[PDB]
Design a protein around this ligand. Structure first.
Ligand SMILES: [Ca+2]
Ligand SMILES: [Ca+2]
Ligand code: NA
Lengths: 104, 103, 104, 103
């Protein structure tokens, strides 16, 4: 049990340690900006309550997927399609970073 | 084919070997803890039967996604959002771990 | 355009070449067995037409997710939860293989 | 912060650099071709407007998942199933590619 905690502590440090990487920071800021753009878009174009626009934005950008909603307008559909690829682009970026920070 | 069977057994042994690595154990415990928390939260805050709270927690944390449910309360929606990133954080941890052992 | 085709051809060979790896073969067979078990389970326990049981099995094991269905019985729910982790276990296996076959 | 901006620009350049690699171009073309095929198929076989066929094709091939649609015909269901594995095959290709450049 003491090993668990010491490993947990080491791992948690490593995580916070990665929060120092400028590229990880960019990816993160880029992700927040994307989630905000999405929240603004869906509430405006699809007329969703801000909290619902962020929710759809989140489950969409992470590939989780929404269980009861899909854009009703053609503008929203087109946007969601491009939105998804930005999300995949961001995920690839994070993964590439990992792959790089593991091989040095 | 003994060959297929031997290759499988070799793979299963490599898998059990993983369940011995401390960092994997932490990640595993953390996800179980995260699933339990989710079950508790959705049962209480969204009024779901525990079994359905576990289900939603699972399909959500894994990015599988729910086919019919979506949080009705604002607290639930905000929790689900942070819950998803915890899941992503956990997945990256397992991935990083698999990229570490591959050396 | 000729480069495209020659690269496409080289890549396609590499893919088929990977179909020779015994571990990839096991993962694959393991995946087919899992999809068949799932198809059998959902058609039996949830009463879904075989083709619908395979569909739900597929979108569930790949994390795609079903847009209009979720198990109705507690037995189905429990099964789906374990089913998902088997799927993640298989994906990790494939990924681990990649990571290994790239570093040699 | 010039620093943030410089780091970003550096990353964007690395991304554009990728769009120059032939294997990436093949994978990219293949996915676009796969998306077009999907749009065509679902419009024709499931009677969806092209825009909705593209949407379903996209959320399906990316594992995002559709919130309200699911194929009504057997041909559609079988196609979706193979479509998903094409998507997984493509993702593994991009992943393998990103694990190759990381050396
Ligand atoms: Ca999904
Ligand atoms: Ca739905
Ligand atoms: Na997913």
């Amino acid at each position: 049990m003491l090993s668990f905690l010491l490993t947990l502590k080491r791992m948690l440090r490593a995580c916070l340690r990665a929060w120092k990487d400028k590229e990880f920071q960019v990816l993160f800021v880029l992700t927040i900006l994307t989630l905000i753009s999405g929240t603004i878009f869906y509430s405006t174009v699809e007329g969703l309550r801000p909290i619902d626009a962020l929710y759809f934005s989140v489950v969409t950008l992470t590939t989780v997927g929404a269980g009861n909603f899909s854009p009703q307008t053609d503008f929203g559909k087109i946007f969601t399609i491009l939105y998804i690829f930005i999300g995949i682009g961001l995920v690839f970026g994070f993964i590439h970073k990992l792959a790089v920070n593991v091989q040095l």
